[PDB]
Amino acid sequence: GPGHLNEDNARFLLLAALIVLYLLGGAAVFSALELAHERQAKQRWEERLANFSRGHNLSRDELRGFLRHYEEATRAGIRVDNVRPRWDFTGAFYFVGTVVSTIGFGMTTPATVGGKIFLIFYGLVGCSSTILFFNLFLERLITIIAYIMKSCHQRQLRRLAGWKPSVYYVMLILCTASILISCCASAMYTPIEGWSYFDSLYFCFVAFSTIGFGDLVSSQNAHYESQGLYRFANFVFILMGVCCIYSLFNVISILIKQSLNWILRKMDSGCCPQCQAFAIMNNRLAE
Amino acid sequence: GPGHLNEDNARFLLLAALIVLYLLGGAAVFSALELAHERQAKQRWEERLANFSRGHNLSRDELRGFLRHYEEATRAGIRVDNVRPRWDFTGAFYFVGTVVSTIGFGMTTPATVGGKIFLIFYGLVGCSSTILFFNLFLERLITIIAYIMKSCHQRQLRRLAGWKPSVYYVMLILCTASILISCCASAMYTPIEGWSYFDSLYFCFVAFSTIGFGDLVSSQNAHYESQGLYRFANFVFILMGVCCIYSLFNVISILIKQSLNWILRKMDSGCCPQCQAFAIMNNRLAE
Ligand SMILES: CCCCC/C=C/C/C=C/C/C=C/C/C=C/CCCC(=O)O
Ligand SMILES: CCCCC/C=C/C/C=C/C/C=C/C/C=C/CCCC(=O)O
Ligand SMILES: CCCCC/C=C/C/C=C/CCCCCCCC(=O)O
Ligand SMILES: CCCCC/C=C/C/C=C/CCCCCCCC(=O)O
Ligand SMILES: [K+]
Ligand SMILES: [K+]
Ligand SMILES: [K+]
Ligand SMILES: [K+]
């Protein structure tokens, strides 16, 4: 039964239901995957706290106050090991780069009322500009791929909007580009930041996808070797990876929309008895 | 001078330069705004650490080790005050919701190799699906606004793709909707989480814009009053706010593209001597 509703509303409802099921399944998987590690780490921390309390003769009240003070310090940008100044010009540049790309690592956060108000306004404008930049970069990359494909075809036969690349081809190119960027960034990060290669790849995916957990943040140590060049390389790699991964997300979203249309059509056609865009859309008028 | 380059490449270059200038200016403003508060907080932490070291007769080595252990505990999900289980089913649902929407608060992060691999794959697929969902929601809201405007016009004259709303109107509706959602969410959060109203508004903007700093995370205390209803309300409000703010970002990006075209045209026309989309684009072919 079609349900006397249009195709688009059915697509919206199906996508919402699928996302809810995906969230439930992912939550179950993650819990079953690392609840034990959580509990072990908590028990280890409790053992360490008890040992420290016994070994230096302090109750839990003074230790609680000290830990609260240290939490305030960390929120202010203090770490046990050496860390770069949090709100110098370079640190502020890192912070605004994280805000502008909606990454938000969290190592640098505003702590003043004026700071937070300016964060709101600046983030609004900059995030809009950055989404526009990502869309423009995706369009430019698609045009480049089309031009290169045309040139290669003309060279092959000798030996633009006409023959444009398909969605699958662009998705494959974006996938391999993201893999290469992540591999190079991890190759740089592993011997510099001291992380493992897998940890570097995980951080690369976290930063590129604009998730920005904040557990791993690059270029945060107080001093580096060739510090300016390292910072420039880190910025370039993060920007390139974020652009590539965002374009990949958009292309996979197009593919998922195609798949959603297909499954909706199949269910409407022969699965009922078997129980047992905005640019040409909203920008077009304002022109 | 046009520079014998097409309009789109010039638009890309101008946007990149403007974003670089915006980043530099924002970094300067943020640094000048809160470097003093940073330094004051750091000095306060140093004073507190020295006082604690003097008052209980411990050197800096044992305190350094204790603070490193506490940092590991916090990375494991331990706080000085009571906090909910980090990787139970509800906590895992919160985590996957943060990952799927690219918010990434950071209070819950994977700590196992399999956890990180599944995070990579699940985040890829879910973020693609969620970007598609946000685009579909924006299209549906635009259609709803068009239908409502048609009905209101027909009622007014009595007393669809034809008369569609413009970009300015949709932007204004999205702005007021985001303001209302943020106000309601702050009204709920202020007496529950204990934050100030301005802090609640700041957290609302941070979460809605998918920045997710992680300094403020809602529904993290161990126990609440009507805990299930509160969690449901928090989820609904965060989802609605994220959708609205993302749509607002896209609309403002369209407006910024219009402005960029205008400034490029003006500079090409009469400012030289004065010195002193993807859907109809890439999805169209694959259909
Ligand atoms: C940034 C996106 C691109 C990511 C490209 C790489 C992602 C794939 C994951 C790499 C494999 C990691 C090997 C680490 C060793 C763990 C043992 C095998 C665990 C398993 O396999 O069960
Ligand atoms: C989520 C996006 C919508 C946000 C809507 C509200 C944002 C505007 C900011 C609200 C004003 C905050 C008042 C706090 C009191 C500070 C004194 C004035 C500081 C100043 O003004 O210099
Ligand atoms: C081509 C110019 C850039 C235009 C688009 C910019 C938007 C994307 C920038 C996001 C960068 C995120 C992290 C940057 C950290 C570098 C700071 C440093 O360690 O020094
Ligand atoms: C209409 C169904 C949803 C479909 C789209 C879902 C994508 C957006 C969801 C992001 C939610 C972010 C935070 C959720 C935290 C709630 C967890 C809890 O405190 O319990
Ligand atoms: K984020
Ligand atoms: K974060
Ligand atoms: K984040
Ligand atoms: K984000």
UniProtKB/Swiss-Prot annotation, chains A, B:
Catalytic activity entry: K(+)(in) = K(+)(out)
Principal place of residence: membrane
Function: K(+) channel that conducts outward rectifying tonic currents potentiated by purinergic signals. Homo- and heterodimerizes to form functional channels with distinct regulatory and gating properties. Contributes most of K(+) currents at the plasma membrane of resting microglia. Maintains a depolarized membrane potential required for proper ramified microglia morphology and phagocytosis, selectively mediating microglial pruning of presynaptic compartments at hippocampal excitatory synapses.
InterPro entries found in the cross-reference section: 2pore_dom_K_chnl, 2pore_dom_K_chnl_THIK, K_chnl_dom
Intramembrane segments: 87-107, 197-217
Gene: KCNK13
The protein's name: Potassium channel subfamily K member 13
Topology relative to the membrane: Multi-pass membrane protein
GO terms (BP aspect): potassium ion transmembrane transport; regulation of excitatory synapse pruning; regulation of NLRP3 inflammasome complex assembly; regulation of resting membrane potential
Keywords from the named record: Cell membrane, Glycoprotein, Ion channel, Ion transport, Membrane, Metal-binding, Potassium, Potassium channel, Potassium transport, Transmembrane, Transmembrane helix, Transport, Voltage-gated channel
Domain notes: Each subunit contributes two pore-forming domains 1 and 2 which assemble to form a single pore with M2 and M4 transmembrane helices lining the central cavity and M1 and M3 facing the lipid bilayer. The transmembrane helices are bridged by the selectivity filters 1 and 2 that coordinate the permeant ions. Up to four ions can simultaneously occupy the selectivity filter and at least two elementary charges must translocate across the filter to convert it into the open conformation.
Record bears the keyword Transferase: no
Subunit structure comment from the entry: Homodimer. Heterodimer with KCNK12.
Gene3D superfamilies from the UniProt entry: 1.10.287.70
Listed GO MF terms: identical protein binding; metal ion binding; outward rectifier potassium channel activity; potassium channel activity; potassium ion leak channel activity; protein heterodimerization activity
Region span, Selectivity filter 1: 102-107
Superkingdom classification of source: Eukaryota
Cellular component per GO, a single term: plasma membrane
Consequence recorded when altering residue 128 to P: Increases channel basal activity. Increases the current amplitude. Confers nonlinear I-V relationship, with currents that saturate upon strong membrane depolarization
Subcellular location: Cell membrane
Activity regulation, per record: The channel conductance is activated by arachidonic acid and inhibited by Ba(2+) ions, volatile anesthetics such as halothane and antiarrhythmic drugs mexiletine and lidocaine. Insensitive to extracellular pH change.
Protein species of origin: Homo sapiens (Human)
Tissue expression summary: Expressed in microglia (at protein level).
Residues where K(+) 2 binds: 103-104, 211-212
